[PDB]
Amino acid sequence: MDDKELIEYFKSQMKEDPDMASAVAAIRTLLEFLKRDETIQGLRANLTSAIETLCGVDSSVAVSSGGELFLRFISLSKCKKIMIERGELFLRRISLSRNKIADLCHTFIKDGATILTHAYSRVVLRVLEAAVAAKKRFSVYVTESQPDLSGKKMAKALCHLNVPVTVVLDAAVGYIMEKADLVIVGAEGVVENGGIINKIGTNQMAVCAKAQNKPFYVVAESFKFVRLFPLNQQDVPDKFKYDLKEEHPWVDYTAPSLITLLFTDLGVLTPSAVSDELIKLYLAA
Amino acid sequence: MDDKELIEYFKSQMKEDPDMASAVAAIRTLLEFLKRDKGIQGLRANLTSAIETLCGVDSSVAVSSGGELFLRFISLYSKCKKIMIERGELFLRRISLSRNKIADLCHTFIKDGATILTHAYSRVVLRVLEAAVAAKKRFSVYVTESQPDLSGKKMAKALCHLNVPVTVVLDAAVGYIMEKADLVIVGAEGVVENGGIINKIGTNQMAVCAKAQNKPFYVVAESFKFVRLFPLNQQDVPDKFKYKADGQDLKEEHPWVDYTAPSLITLLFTDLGVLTPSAVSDELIKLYLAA
Amino acid sequence: MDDKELIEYFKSQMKEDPDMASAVAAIRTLLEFLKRDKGETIQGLRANLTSAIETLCGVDSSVAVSSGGELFLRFISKCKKIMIERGELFLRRISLSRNKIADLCHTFIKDGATILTHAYSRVVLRVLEAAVAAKKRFSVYVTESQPDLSGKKMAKALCHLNVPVTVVLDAAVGYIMEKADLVIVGAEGVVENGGIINKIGTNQMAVCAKAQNKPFYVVAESFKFVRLFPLNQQDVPDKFKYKALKEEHPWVDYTAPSLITLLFTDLGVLTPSAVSDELIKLYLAAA
């Protein structure tokens, strides 16, 4: 398969189903590139990793970690295209994650609570969507999240579920914090120490949450567990972030000390237990 | 002089000189109003009062604190002999000194090669940083663009036109950027009795992130901004100061200012001296009583 | 429990014990009223009808009754509520206040010191008791303190601890000042700026001590910390005063922080300017 097509196939997977997580449309586009493509067994384990970076035309870690997890799962006679049935098993397996999570933390969303989130998140949406359809009564505050204003999009979405929701400037988090009971957020990437890479602004929320001792919860699919051990902002590779100057990073890092619990499709986790989980995950035969 | 006149005179003062503190512009037009007022002593009082609040049509704490302090300092045949105007001009002459006293006091704390972080546009911080280039100090700035009026951007150009390196960052990247800073220098719309401050929404966030990384948080502010409020939380800042300033789905949240408690501030640089938050209550009494 | 009961209950708390502070007697009554409020139902109405009673108790102009009362309702965030657990925890702690202050302060009464105090103060009394129990030797001068003469009552109480004491006219304060080593005074309330509202005659005693470099010490409980910031006498609510050929009779005056050296509290020794930080912590207790 071709690169420009590799991209067109990838972008179209997301246009046809907005519901779909970047990473899933990507590990999915590989499954298509694999079928549609043979010669040098090397070109196999090559071209695919020679294209996971190509559709690295996203800049997100989810895509990179989702992809590495995929290529690794479909491993171990040119009929070794058992890989394709492995890939479909892996794609079938990760399409149950959101739901696993949306109900793995129904108990943490308490009736009469005021929830604060940042930007848009397909996973928090399901979590909350699961909460309203379970008759839980709650309110929500969400930052507008510059520059795409995806938090506004998130607000319209919560409105359609008839959930009371207020939009606030990113600069108002410190101010509105005292009004919330807890913070729930998504993750573009769960890092090796349990910290997370997420839409720029997540870090600040976490700090204002800790300062007022509001639990800060995180919900993310296990395919977002990435092989990285950052200790500060600078540690995050620019690949993922992007005299008068301007700096427009897209994601920042939130140390594990600022996280209460991670709700994953592998269960509830304390940030410190994440590393053992990654290796337990790989040791999946 | 009637309301329409006041307002136009007040806005003129600000268009005349954009670097003039909003409060300074205000006491100036109060002084002009007091000069024209053709109305006994009692009248003059509620007259120069039922207009100060009219000037309140700039929901800034400073305009309020400045006016109050002015009426206080100015207050006391007898009629005409009103030595009020004289005191008025004297008061006006001292508060116009303040900004420079702060510049001198503060720049002293900017270590050479330091990266300073700021929020929005602040005239006094601008003067503090000029006092810094003058002291031959080399530094670099990071400033939030500050929604919704993007006043941070305007701050960046001012600095660019002074030749100091300046980088603009999204309000959402303060926690992210904190790492690269040595200290935070922010102005204030008002200084409350407990030492805390009322300022451009976004300020609190910066101070909380600053404290978490043990970065000194400095405030630079003229004393006519000392206001008589003792907030315990955000809900304690009167609404007339946070709204109209400069169904199910609600953007119902557009506060213009926020509150930063005394425990998040390291030092306040004032014309009255370098004060720690606790020391503010004694200076605020001395200020308001001095007369 | 209804209004009749409250006022009766509150009054019989102090009845069964005159040595009790008004705010403590008032706080205990909110605790009973709370308990005897099962007739209520929503966690909201308990907290609501509970505010209705503070006012009722407000029938005791005392500042501490307001602040103690407010602080009480604050330390408490279905039909089944653990608020009472907090209300008793709260009562349990303000009951240690007076004593923490006595063993915190007595240590500062040097041997042979002559102390000057004003009118009657339960806290100042506990303090001196701790000093004679500590085997310290001092003497006291106390203003008779018009119009109720509580100073004379204070004097007799002290005489019964065998502490040498002399009663003097409220007008003889500036006169007697030169023979005092320090001044100790209680407080009806502690204001946001570290200043204090107390029995009329306190202000001038402070100004006088100031002019002779005599240290001036306030000893008071934390439930007396109140949300006020007065710049002069007029700024003191009349609810607490009773005032500003006529006569004036304010029952309390205001003493500025510039006139106080140290405040001895259950939160520790404080300078007036540090009161604002402690008042904040104190009011945002629950967090």
UniProtKB/Swiss-Prot annotation, chain B:
It comes from Homo sapiens (Human). The modification N6-acetyllysine is found at K35. Keywords: Acetylation, Cytoplasm, Disease variant, Initiation factor, Leukodystrophy, Protein biosynthesis. GO terms for cellular component: cytoplasm; cytosol; eukaryotic translation initiation factor 2B complex; membrane; plasma membrane. Belongs to the eIF-2B alpha/beta/delta subunits family. SUPFAM superfamilies: NagB/RpiA/CoA transferase-like (SSF100950). Signal peptide: none annotated. It is found in: Cytoplasm, Cytosol. Component of the translation initiation factor 2B (eIF2B) complex which is a heterodecamer of two sets of five different subunits: alpha, beta, gamma, delta and epsilon. Subunits alpha, beta and delta comprise a regulatory subcomplex and subunits epsilon and gamma comprise a catalytic subcomplex. Within the complex, the hexameric regulatory complex resides at the center, with the two heterodimeric catalytic subcomplexes bound on opposite sides. Its main location: cytoplasm. GO terms for biological process: cytoplasmic translational initiation; oligodendrocyte development; response to glucose; response to heat; response to peptide hormone; T cell receptor signaling pathway; translational initiation. The gene is EIF2B1. Activated by the chemical integrated stress response (ISR) inhibitor ISRIB which stimulates guanine nucleotide exchange factor activity for both phosphorylated and unphosphorylated eIF2. Acts as a component of the translation initiation factor 2B (eIF2B) complex, which catalyzes the exchange of GDP for GTP on eukaryotic initiation factor 2 (eIF2) gamma subunit. Its guanine nucleotide exchange factor activity is repressed when bound to eIF2 complex phosphorylated on the alpha subunit, thereby limiting the amount of methionyl-initiator methionine tRNA available to the ribosome and consequently global translation is repressed. PANTHER family: TRANSLATION INITIATION FACTOR EIF-2B SUBUNIT ALPHA. This is Translation initiation factor eIF2B subunit alpha. It is linked to Leukoencephalopathy with vanishing white matter 1: An autosomal recessive brain disease characterized by neurological features including progressive cerebellar ataxia, spasticity, and cognitive deficits. Brain imaging shows abnormal white matter that vanishes over time and is replaced by cerebrospinal fluid. Disease severity ranges from fatal infantile forms to adult forms without neurological deterioration. The disease is progressive with, in most individuals, additional episodes of rapid deterioration following febrile infections or minor head trauma. Coiled coil: none annotated. GO terms for molecular function: guanyl-nucleotide exchange factor activity; identical protein binding; translation initiation factor activity.
